[PDB]
Paper text:
Importantly, aberrant FGF/FGFR signaling has been linked to several developmental syndromes and a broad range of human malignancies. The involvement in the pathology of many cancer types provides a strong rationale for development of effective agents for these targets; consequently, there is a large ongoing effort to develop FGFR inhibitors as anticancer treatments. A number of crystal structures of FGFR KD in non-phosphorylated and phosphorylated forms have been reported. The 3D-structures highlighted the features that undergo substantial changes and play a key role in the activation process; of particular importance is the A-loop and so called “molecular brake”.
The residue corresponding to R669 in FGFR3 is conserved and also mutated in all other FGFRs in cancer as well as in FGFR2 in bone dysplasia. To assess the mechanism that underpins activation, we first analyzed the R to G replacement in the context of FGFR1 KD that is more amenable to crystallography compared to FGFR3 KD. R675G FGFR1 KD variant also has higher activity compared to the WT. Notably, in the inactive FGFR1 KD there is direct hydrogen bonding between R675 and H650 from the A-loop; in addition, R675 is found to share a tight van der Waals interaction with active site tyrosine Y653 and H650 (bottom left inset). These interactions are disturbed and broken in R675G mutant (top inset), thus favoring the A-loop to adopt an open conformation as found in the active FGFR1-3P (bottom right inset). In turn, this open conformation of the A-loop leads to several rearrangements of various control elements in the KD – including ordering of spine residues, dissociation in the molecular brake interacting residues, repositioning of the αC-helix and movement of the N-lobe toward the C-lobe. We suggest a similar allosteric mechanism for FGFR1 R675G and corresponding FGFR3 R669G mutation that is in this case triggered by the loss of inhibitory interactions in the vicinity of the A-loop that involve the R675/669 residue. Moreover, we have established that an infrequent cancer mutation corresponding to R669G in FGFR3, also found in bone dysplasia, greatly enhances kinase activity of FGFR. Nevertheless, structural studies of this mutation in the context of FGFR1 KD (R675G) are fully consistent with its activating potential. Furthermore, we here reveal a new feature of FGFR KD that stabilizes the inactive conformation which, when disrupted by mutations, can result in activation – namely, a set of interactions in the vicinity of the A-loop that involve R669/675.
Author numbering: 460 to 584, 592 to 762
The structure:
């Protein structure tokens, strides 16, 4: 990207004056997000302003940070609108910093959201959620991922921290900087040493560098475990340095406390050693729907 100079796309281009920057939201690693006001997005009612989130490069940006930003933008162009995916609102691509303008989620990411609602239990440290609530979180994220897979897209970074919660408590998948398009190819091969959090990586992705929708399913299993620990961190006590060996020996996380055996069996299913023997996101959606219907 050190000189692939960005083209223009009038469909998505929003002039920089129609954007007013304010408080910073997220931080760290590959970029930076600030809260902003956008003047006349939907056009047909062009004098109202919308609260939006703006992704941009941070202070000491690297080539790959920029590459990731651009890629996130284009990927979100390809994916399209869906109820459970933070969708693209616009972009500032010419004559200044790259600005990727996306939907704003007032209630933060799923991990924070879940941790803010932990009952005063012994396995821990707002108002609590019912079982049907959590299972509905799982269901929503599953819908989003099913849609992603229908569009031949691999997220590669599916985790609680990358799921956002809206004002109406809707789940919306975010962070597409590492997302890859696998239209008309069997898999995606990763660089020699990856840039994705190890504890969410499927074994075939960690050891062999193969990414498919199935590895995303693995990640979703870890996400289930995160949801029903109400924001716990995967493989508690286990340092990354020691996870490898464990995974190569068949180690799997235990059943979280407040969790049915059906859901833990779903987690274990997502964590199958053989990728092809894992459920698809469609099957996961069907299952989670069935379970939602049988819960209160």
């Amino acid at each position: 990207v050190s000189e692939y100079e960005l083209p223009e796309d009038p469909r998505w281009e929003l002039p920089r004056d129609r954007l007013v920057l304010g408080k910073p939201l997220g931080e760290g690693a590959f970029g930076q997000v600030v809260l902003a006001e956008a003047i006349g997005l939907d056009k047909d009612k062009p004098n109202r302003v919308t609260k939006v989130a703006v992704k941009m490069l941070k202070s000491d940006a690297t080539e790959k940070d920029l590459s990731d930003l651009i890629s996130e933008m284009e990927m979100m162009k390809m994916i399209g609108k869906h109820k459970n995916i933070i969708n693209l609102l616009g972009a500032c691509t010419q004559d200044g910093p790259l600005y990727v303008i996306v939907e704003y989620a007032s209630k933060g990411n799923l991990r924070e959201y879940l941790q803010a609602r932990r009952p005063p239990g012994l396995e821990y440290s707002e108002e609590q959620l019912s079982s049907k609530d959590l299972v509905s979180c799982a269901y929503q994220v599953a819908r989003g991922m099913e849609y992603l897979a229908s569009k031949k897209c691999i997220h590669r970074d599916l985790a609680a921290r990358n799921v956002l919660v809206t004002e109406d408590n809707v789940m919306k998948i975010a962070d597409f900087g590492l997302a890859r398009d696998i239209h008309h190819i069997d898999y995606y091969k990763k660089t020699t040493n990856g840039r994705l959090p190890v504890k969410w990586m499927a074994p075939e992705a960690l050891f062999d560098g193969i990414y498919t929708h199935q590895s995303d399913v693995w990640s979703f299993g870890v996400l289930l475990w995160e949801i029903f620990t109400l924001g716990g961190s995967p493989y508690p006590g286990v340092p990354v340095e020691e996870l490898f060996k464990l995974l190569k020996e068949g180690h799997r996380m235990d059943k979280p406390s407040n969790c049915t055996n059906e859901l833990y069996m779903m987690m274990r299913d997502c964590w199958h050693a053989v990728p092809s023997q894992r459920p698809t996101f469609k099957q996961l959606v069907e299952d989670l729907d069935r379970i939602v219907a049988l819960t209160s």
